[PDB]
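Q: A reviewer asked whether we had any structural model of the full assembly, not just the individual parts. We don't, so I'm hoping you can provide one. Inputs are below.
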Amino acid sequence: MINVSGFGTGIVIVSASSFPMGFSLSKFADDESPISSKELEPFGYEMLYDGGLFAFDKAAPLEVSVSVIAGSEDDINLRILLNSKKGSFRFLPGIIPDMTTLVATLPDGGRTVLSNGTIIKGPAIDTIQNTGRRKGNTYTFVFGSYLGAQT
Amino acid sequence: YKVITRGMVFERMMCTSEALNQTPDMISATPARLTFSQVLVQNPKPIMFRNAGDSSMIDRGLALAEDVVGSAGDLFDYAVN
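A: Here is a predicted structure for the entire assembly that you could use as a starting point for your response.
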């Protein structure tokens, strides 16, 4: 059998300036997917006029999204990260506040070193659902470095 | 300027136009559209020389030698010194 569980997953987000030491996401949401990423597209194809095929490279962002429980310390840290304008930081040949998410998936030890990226979108205020229970908050980051997976 | 985009070296290039754009879609950075145009030259490859003695001579045409006043005594004192 293959264990494809998700319990025990931890995330460590380290930002260049906002959180140089970094924070840890462990409290993930129950209604929304704790981690969700759209399919990477690093290749493209074009049709030649003789029916042939040509294959080339494209620029492939990695848009990841993490869902956290409303009101938790991870949610507060992510909101603090969201509310940090890029124009208030010193600039280097790198990226405005370069933030990397070390993802430790399960006791399998799968470590993902998604880096060279930044947060993009998230909820500013908590939305109260019809049921009366605040919706889990999904924050989306984008990355340009998507290698480092082990085991 | 020499523009090297992707293994595509371009020499003798000068900026013809340039346009900045400031919009609420980019509040930190500013998009900019630059346009360069190559300076057409009669000889793409010129011939030079190593040592400083052997140029081909360049002619200055008619000059209309301008006028100064120093008298010959001043020139003589200058040559003496």
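A: Points you may want to mention in the reply: The CA atoms of residues 12 and 46 of chain B lie 13 Å apart. The first helix of chain B runs from residue 71 to 80.
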